[PDB]
């Protein structure tokens, strides 16, 4: 069986050879990286001399699309922010080889997920997890700027980067599930735990829905576990409403979801359709706030007092808005005292 001229496998994958030279330019050492898209290889540019990773798409035309799209976003990005300060990963150029569209990028490291395994799942430090925070919503503000008014979608940790493996700078990847403010197409995104209560309940969404995936983020960084772990949507829904309380009466009524999981009281109130009972499972006691932090591993650790806990509380509730309109956005959000 022969796929692509004996190129690719049958997961429409090119076949990584050590050693292989393409294009008379880039010398293919070795697979670094995987995913639905397809691959990451570590290269060495000869032109450039440097190494680089290729991300290498599937020779298949969804992916092929997908890619596309994405690359017209990084271009973007790239022609208003020359100075690669604003924490999205940098595209040098990209290519099509062999039938697979190539994209060639700035060596990274490990993702946020991968580093949460190293830490076995117990979280990083609040002085970590403030670092990537500030640096998340910079990349934030960026996207948000009138020209790119983009939509990242698909915002959870393993699409955030290391650059360096000692080193907390970080970048964020993989654009190819993102829209822009004025071409909103998709009804069905995000990934589940991170996925806004907006999209949830089938209502119009803006760039308010990466700011709902942050918190999220921000409190599995720090903890080593998941916020809101749905089994799906019914789920992801309660698991929700177990910390934040039942969304506001306001949201509901304009719903075209609301009744996939709330029902409506003849007080006019909604209640849940037949969990810890609404808003007591509380992201004080999650935290560890008053009581040394996640577990109790923070105890008597420097950088984890009530007062630092009490900030970054109060900085994920506002992240955790139901309301997208009064949600933090990245301005405000980098203002926060959680900050100074
Ligand atoms: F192989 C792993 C180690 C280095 N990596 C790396 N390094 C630079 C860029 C990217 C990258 C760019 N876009 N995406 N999208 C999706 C996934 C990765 C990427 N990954 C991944």
């Given at each position: 069986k022969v796929y692509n001229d004996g190129y690719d496998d049958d997961n429409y994958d090119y076949i990584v050879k050590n050693g292989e030279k393409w294009m008379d330019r880039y010398e293919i050492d070795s697979l670094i990286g995987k995913g639905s898209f397809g691959q990451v290889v570590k290269a060495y540019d000869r032109v450039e001399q440097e190494w680089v990773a290729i991300k290498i798409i599937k020779n298949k035309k969804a992916f092929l699309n997908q890619a596309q799209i994405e690359v017209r976003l990084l271009e973007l990005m790239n022609k208003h922010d020359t100075e690669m300060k604003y924490y999205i990963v940098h595209l040098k150029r990209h290519f099509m080889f062999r039938n697979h569209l190539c994209l060639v990028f700035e060596m990274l490291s490990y993702n946020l997920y991968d580093l949460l395994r190293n830490t076995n799942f117990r979280g990083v430090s609040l002085n970590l997890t403030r670092k990537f925070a500030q640096q998340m919503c910079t990349a934030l503000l960026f996207l948000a700027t009138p020209e790119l008014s983009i939509i990242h979608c698909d915002l959870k940790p393993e699409n955030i980067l290391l650059c360096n493996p000692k080193r907390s700078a970080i970048k964020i990847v993989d654009f190819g599930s993102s829209c822009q403010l004025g071409q909103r197409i998709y009804q069905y995104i995000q990934s589940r735990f991170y996925r806004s209560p907006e999209v949830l309940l089938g209502m119009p969404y803006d760039l308010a829905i990466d700011m709902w995936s942050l918190g999220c983020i921000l409190v599995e960084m720090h903890t080593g576990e998941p916020l809101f772990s749905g089994a799906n949507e019914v789920d992801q829904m309660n698991k929700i409403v177990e910390v934040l309380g039942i969304p506001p009466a306001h949201i509901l009524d304009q719903a075209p979801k609301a009744r996939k999981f709330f029902e409506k009281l003849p007080d006019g109130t909604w209640n849940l359709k037949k969990y810890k009972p609404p808003?007591?499972?509380?992201l004080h006691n999650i935290l560890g706030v008053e009581t040394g932090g996640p577990g109790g591993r923070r105890a008597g650790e420097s950088g984890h007092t009530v007062a630092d806990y009490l900030k970054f509380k109060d900085l994920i509730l506002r992240m955790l808005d139901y309301d997208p309109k009064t949600r933090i956005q990245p301005y405000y959000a980098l203002q926060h005292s959680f900050f100074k």
């Open positions: 808003g007591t499972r509380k």
